[PDB]
A = this chain, B = another copy of it.
Amino acid sequence: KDYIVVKGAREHNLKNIDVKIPRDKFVVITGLSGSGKSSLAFDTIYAEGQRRYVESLSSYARQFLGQMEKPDVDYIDGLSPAIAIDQKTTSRNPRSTVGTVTEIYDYLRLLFARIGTPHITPRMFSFNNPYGACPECTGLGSLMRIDPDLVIPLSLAQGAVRASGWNIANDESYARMYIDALAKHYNFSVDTPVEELPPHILDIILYGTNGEKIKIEYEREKGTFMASFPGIINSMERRYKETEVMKQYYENFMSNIPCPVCKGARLKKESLAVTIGGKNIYEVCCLSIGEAKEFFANLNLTERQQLIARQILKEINARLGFLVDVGLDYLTLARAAGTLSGGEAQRIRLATQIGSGLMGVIYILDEPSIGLHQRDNDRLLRSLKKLRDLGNTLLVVEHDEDTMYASDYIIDLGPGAGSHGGQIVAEGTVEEIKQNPNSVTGEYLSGRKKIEVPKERRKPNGKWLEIIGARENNLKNINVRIPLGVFTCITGVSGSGKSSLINEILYKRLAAELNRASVKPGEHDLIKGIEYLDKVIDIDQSPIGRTPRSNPATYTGVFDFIREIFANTTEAKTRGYKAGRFSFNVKGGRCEACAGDGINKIEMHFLPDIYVPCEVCKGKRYNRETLEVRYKGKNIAEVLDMTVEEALEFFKNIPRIHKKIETLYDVGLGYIKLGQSSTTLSGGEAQRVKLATELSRKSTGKTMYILDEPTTGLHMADVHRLVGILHRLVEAGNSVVVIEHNLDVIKTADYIIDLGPEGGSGGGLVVAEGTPEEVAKVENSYTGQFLKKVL
């Protein structure tokens, strides 16, 4: 009725816990990273609600949506349909923009049709219908095409065509025999240079024969057939239109340009003649949300116009107010939804959900406050509480103190992670958790544990990285200086351009200069001080592997030492074994039946592929003869089965393994097991693995680390550990640059660069620079204002 009773929850590492979540209330789930709160929420409640709603729909719709796996839960009662909002974005299609996603373009079209004065039909203003879409660009506004300068950057035999699937290097490839047939038809030499080729022949080859029929001969068996040359450009365009990695690869060689006729207006030349208050539809859509709302509020109409357009104006004002209160007062209604970050997309989805007014729906949010400045926390909390107040329930998974102080109910898991977590430690109001003596969240909220402000701060040693003439996006031609050898943190409000300035300019230029990559840096003049750097490393939450053949033991490189010490035993020496025998990636020591994968594929008549453990090897991925070899009473499979904490004690007598295992333990991965597949690892686990690998390396003092919000989905203890690890890395001799919005991390940094003073058009500048104490003295700085009370 008024509760969500869950019994027998055993998904992932949950230790058969029973919980009662009050309905129509603000509920937050807390715990350490990997403690199972994310599993308990998403894999149980969201999955059960989505399955219960989908299975009751039409058969075709259910088949299209797929067959969701049934969670390992006894029974759940009082479960309304669940909608999950998380930081995930897709390119999707160019047809969708911010206005269409937020469902305000329809209201704008209705208003323009009803009251717009021509210089009147709602479908005339839409670019998704032939009645309004521009004839040339088909309502897209961007004539995407592949320029000839990129297809042929040398004769054909030297590798002129760099496009995938058109490599004429192979003699028997389709491209080779098509080129041979074309050369036979047009009587030209393939080995002739492209520049020396006649323009007509080159144009015919590039753009095809335009439907002309030619004879093509193919040899395996021999035969002949009649067909036509489609052309490289036409085939690439058709492949692009047929269907995200392939889309990104195709768009890499593309050259986006504005439509020559509509100039990106996406509409016919006659639809733009209708204006409201001196601004047509495109000009209104080009304004930022705040100024558009101000213009709508200040708009003056006659009595008849006000009576005929009251409801549309009220709806537009309400939606714009919701969007502003969410925090996106800098975005434009005409901006493409594809070029949006995860936090911006999540906030837009939240605003749309608030505007829709759906009732009786369980809402689950995964860290809505990440990627958002501290000044917008109150607005975000007010929006969340309004969404709850409209007749819904919230299951936010957050680790922010303000969220705990604003939430009605708090559920805490733990007390550790992995095999030590998965059970509820404490629950109730914030006061009850604060008074609870066995809760980590209560301990960190009551002041028992805290992050201390360092007494001594490092200073630059005379090495600086100067970026000159940065003008990409909203950057107003600013020059910044990043000291080398100290912990540098870059702050600023959302949309100020810090993320672009770092990721798409500094990292790309450093990679091109040092790692010898092939990327296009952002619009800037030059970078000074690169000679002081030897390598650039970027650490993110991307998975460390896409195959089941990768595990942390191999990634950290400790598996080589483990195999060496295994082969150094007397049994392997007497049996003539090698260090490579104890590996599930090379034939000789792996199971032959399962090919070392450990699972087998079974095909059903009317079901997808089902995987079961291999019968002969029992999932140990090794043959019996190899497994007979034991080192100190444990075989290779048992060693792979140990966790990092146990491996620390087991391998304490071998320094070369002990150092790596201790690094893995210190980066907070003491609950993980060496045999875990890299595919099953989460973002935090992958980031910790990368940090451990970086720590295990021998630093030369000329390395730069770039991190983009490393505190995503991290508890207070995790933040403390990450701060300690970053300080250790800085003290090693390298330099660390972090884009952070967390005050706890910010206050421990040695240098702070602030970008503001606003977001969007008003941003792109530099407000404050120096140590946090110096930045706190700047009056016109939000970060300084917050650090004034934080310190």
Contact surface of A with B, Cβ cutoff 8 Å:
1, 52-53, 56-59, 61, 64-66, 70, 74-75, 77-81, 83, 85, 88, 90, 92-95, 106, 128-131, 133, 138-140, 220-226, 241, 311, 315, 349, 352-353, 356-361, 391, 602, 604-607, 610, 612
Residues of B within 8 A of A356 (CB): 52, 56
Question: Do residues B59 and A83 form an inter-chain contact, with CB atoms below 8 A?
Answer: no
Residues of B within 8 A of A1 (CB): 391
Residues of B within 8 A of A241 (CB): 605-606
A619 to chain B, nearest CB (A): 14
Distance A221 CA – B359 CA, assembled complex (angstroms): 67
Residues of B within 8 A of A70 (CB): 106
Residues of B within 8 A of A358 (CB): 52-53, 56, 79-81
Distance A81 CA – B604 CA, assembled complex (angstroms): 35
A607 to chain B, nearest CB (A): 6
Question: Do residues B224 and A221 form an inter-chain contact, with CB atoms below 8 A?
Answer: yes
Distance A221 CA – B602 CA, assembled complex (angstroms): 44
Distance A128 CA – B1 CA, assembled complex (angstroms): 34
- From A106, which residue of chain B is reached at the shortest CB distance? B70
Question: Do residues A128 and B607 form an inter-chain contact, with CB atoms below 8 A?
Answer: yes
Q: Report which of B133, B361, B610 forms a contact with A604, defined as CB distance below 8 A.
A: B133
Instruction: Indicate whether A604 sits within 8 Å of B138 (C-beta atoms), given known contacts A53-B83, A223-B222, A353-B56.
Output: yes
Residues of B within 8 A of A222 (CB): 223-224
Residues of B within 8 A of A140 (CB): 605-606
Q: Report which of B64, B223, B225, B352 forms a contact with A224, defined as CB distance below 8 A.
A: B223
Q: List 27 A-B contacts (CB under 8 A).
A: A1-B391, A52-B356, A52-B358, A53-B53, A53-B83, A53-B361, A56-B83, A56-B349, A56-B352, A59-B90, A64-B65, A64-B66, A75-B311, A80-B361, A81-B81, A81-B360, A95-B606, A128-B604, A130-B604, A130-B610, A130-B612, A133-B604, A138-B605, A139-B604, A221-B226, A222-B223, A241-B605
A74 to chain B, nearest CB (A): 7
Distance A52 CA – B311 CA, assembled complex (angstroms): 21
Instruction: Indicate whether A94 sits within 8 Å of B129 (C-beta atoms), given known contacts A66-B64, A360-B80.
Output: no
Question: Do residues B221 and A361 form an inter-chain contact, with CB atoms below 8 A?
Answer: no
A213 to chain B, nearest CB (A): 12
Question: Do residues B131 and A612 form an inter-chain contact, with CB atoms below 8 A?
Answer: yes
Give the most central of A66, A225, A356, A612: most B CB within 10 Å.
A356
Distance A90 CA – B223 CA, assembled complex (angstroms): 47
Distance A79 CA – B128 CA, assembled complex (angstroms): 27
Distance A661 CA – B352 CA, assembled complex (angstroms): 53
A197 to chain B, nearest CB (A): 30
Q: Report which of B65, B77, B220 forms a contact with A65, defined as CB distance below 8 A.
A: B65
- From A137, which residue of chain B is reached at the shortest CB distance? B605
Residues of B within 8 A of A226 (CB): 221
Known: A78-B359, A81-B361, A140-B605. 4 other contacts (CB 8 A): A53-B358, A79-B357, A80-B358, A241-B606
Distance A747 CA – B343 CA, assembled complex (angstroms): 68
Question: Closest 3 CB pairs between A and B?
Answer: A223-B223, A360-B360, A64-B64
- From A59, which residue of chain B is reached at the shortest CB distance? B90
Distance A58 CA – B83 CA, assembled complex (angstroms): 9
Q: Report which of B65, B78, B88 forms a contact with A61, defined as CB distance below 8 A.
A: B65
Q: Is the interface of A mostly helix, strand, loop or mixed?
A: loop
Instruction: Indicate whether A92 sits within 8 Å of B59 (C-beta atoms), given known contacts A133-B604, A225-B220.
Output: yes
Q: Report which of B221, B225, B352 forms a contact with A221, defined as CB distance below 8 A.
A: B225
- From A144, which residue of chain B is reached at the shortest CB distance? B605
A57 to chain B, nearest CB (A): 7
Distance A88 CA – B57 CA, assembled complex (angstroms): 12
Question: Do residues B52 and A93 form an inter-chain contact, with CB atoms below 8 A?
Answer: no
Residues of B within 8 A of A138 (CB): 604-605
- From A66, which residue of chain B is reached at the shortest CB distance? B64
Question: Do residues A359 and B360 form an inter-chain contact, with CB atoms below 8 A?
Answer: yes
Q: Report which of B83, B95, B225 forms a contact with A223, defined as CB distance below 8 A.
A: B225
- From A604, which residue of chain B is reached at the shortest CB distance? B138
A110 to chain B, nearest CB (A): 9
Q: Report which of B59, B133, B602 forms a contact with A130, defined as CB distance below 8 A.
A: B602
A392 to chain B, nearest CB (A): 9
Distance A759 CA – B748 CA, assembled complex (angstroms): 78
Residues of B within 8 A of A93 (CB): 606
A434 to chain B, nearest CB (A): 33
- From A215, which residue of chain B is reached at the shortest CB distance? B221
Question: Do residues B359 and A79 form an inter-chain contact, with CB atoms below 8 A?
Answer: yes
Q: Report which of B56, B66, B361, B606 forms a contact with A94, defined as CB distance below 8 A.
A: B606
Distance A663 CA – B62 CA, assembled complex (angstroms): 44
A51 to chain B, nearest CB (A): 10
Distance A59 CA – B225 CA, assembled complex (angstroms): 43
Instruction: Indicate whether A357 sits within 8 Å of B77 (C-beta atoms), given known contacts A65-B64, A602-B130, A607-B128.
Output: yes
Question: Do residues B77 and A53 form an inter-chain contact, with CB atoms below 8 A?
Answer: no
- From A224, which residue of chain B is reached at the shortest CB distance? B221
A371 to chain B, nearest CB (A): 19
Question: Do residues B65 and A81 form an inter-chain contact, with CB atoms below 8 A?
Answer: no
Residues of B within 8 A of A52 (CB): 356, 358
A335 to chain B, nearest CB (A): 18
A257 to chain B, nearest CB (A): 15
Distance A153 CA – B75 CA, assembled complex (angstroms): 55
Question: Do residues A315 and B605 form an inter-chain contact, with CB atoms below 8 A?
Answer: no
Residues of B within 8 A of A74 (CB): 311
Distance A131 CA – B612 CA, assembled complex (angstroms): 9
Distance A70 CA – B357 CA, assembled complex (angstroms): 17
Distance A607 CA – B92 CA, assembled complex (angstroms): 12
Distance A57 CA – B356 CA, assembled complex (angstroms): 14
Distance A679 CA – B97 CA, assembled complex (angstroms): 35
Distance A90 CA – B58 CA, assembled complex (angstroms): 10
- From A611, which residue of chain B is reached at the shortest CB distance? B130
Distance A315 CA – B241 CA, assembled complex (angstroms): 52
- From A393, which residue of chain B is reached at the shortest CB distance? B360
A697 to chain B, nearest CB (A): 38
- From A90, which residue of chain B is reached at the shortest CB distance? B59
A88 to chain B, nearest CB (A): 8
Residues of B within 8 A of A612 (CB): 130-131
Distance A224 CA – B315 CA, assembled complex (angstroms): 69
Distance A1 CA – B454 CA, assembled complex (angstroms): 54
Distance A599 CA – B223 CA, assembled complex (angstroms): 44
Distance A184 CA – B75 CA, assembled complex (angstroms): 66
Residues of B within 8 A of A53 (CB): 53, 81, 83, 358, 361
Residues of B within 8 A of A56 (CB): 83, 85, 349, 352-353, 356, 358
Give the most central of A57, A85, A222, A223: most B CB within 10 Å.
A223
A472 to chain B, nearest CB (A): 28
Distance A79 CA – B391 CA, assembled complex (angstroms): 11
A519 to chain B, nearest CB (A): 27
A56 to chain B, nearest CB (A): 5
A143 to chain B, nearest CB (A): 10
Distance A220 CA – B80 CA, assembled complex (angstroms): 62
- From A103, which residue of chain B is reached at the shortest CB distance? B55
Residues of B within 8 A of A223 (CB): 221-225
Instruction: Indicate whether A360 sits within 8 Å of B361 (C-beta atoms), given known contacts A57-B83, A131-B612, A138-B605.
Output: yes
Q: Report which of B95, B225, B357, B604 forms a contact with A607, defined as CB distance below 8 A.
A: B95
Distance A80 CA – B362 CA, assembled complex (angstroms): 11
